[PDB]
């Protein structure tokens, strides 16, 4: 559960090699942030190209093909072409894989 | 709800009008980055379930 995540994060902050020693001018930095518009700024063609590495290509074509459909509200019809449909079943995979691509950009490959 | 629908229908047509907002070089960068990461871990791709996966 997420409070156990918080508890293990606090234990990981505690158990580093000499983490609270500041006799020689060391510093600790805690960044917390949010990826703004992560759900709306996923291009579907780039998503298909990144998705064909891990599954069969018909599966990736089915996952990309569901996102390109018409959304309706009672009088209003418009097609979707940019950003994923977040309310799908399998969309819980799509956010977790694409955000993995962010970890290769932030954290670096070596680290 | 109608105002947000008018905003979404406008921004999708703006994406269709202005072209893709991503460049090719950044796409090649993230694609080769994903290729190097998945080849560094020896990831085997997920197969299609043929006739009877027994799960």
């Amino acid at each position: 559960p997420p409070p156990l995540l918080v508890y293990k994060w606090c234990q990981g902050i505690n158990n580093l090699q000499d983490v609270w020693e500041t006799s020689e001018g060391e510093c600790n930095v805690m960044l917390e942030s949010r990826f703004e518009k992560m759900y709306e700024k996923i291009d579907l063609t780039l998503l298909n190209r990144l998705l064909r590495l891990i599954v069969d290509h018909n599966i990736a074509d089915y996952m990309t093909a569901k996102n390109n459909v018409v959304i309706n509200y009672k009088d209003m019809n418009h097609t979707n072409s940019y950003g994923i449909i977040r309310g799908l079943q399998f969309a819980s995979f799509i956010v977790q894989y694409y955000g993995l691509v962010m970890d290769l950009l932030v954290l670096g490959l070596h680290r | 709800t109608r105002l947000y629908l008018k905003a979404e229908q406008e921004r999708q047509h703006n994406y269709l009008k202005d072209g893709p907002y991503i460049t090719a070089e950044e796409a090649v960068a993230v694609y080769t980055t994903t290729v190097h990461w998945l080849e560094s871990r020896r990831f085997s791709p997920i197969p299609f379930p043929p006739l009877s996966y027994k799960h």
Binding site: - | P20, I22, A24, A27
Partner: peptide, 22 residues
């Protein structure tokens, strides 16, 4: 196989997609 090429696209948008995504 046989890449997706979204339902939708106009002429120049298809040209830009074929340019940057191939």
């Amino acid at each position: 196989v046989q890449p997706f090429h979204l339902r939708g696209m106009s002429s120049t948008f298809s040209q830009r997609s074929r340019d940057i995504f191939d």
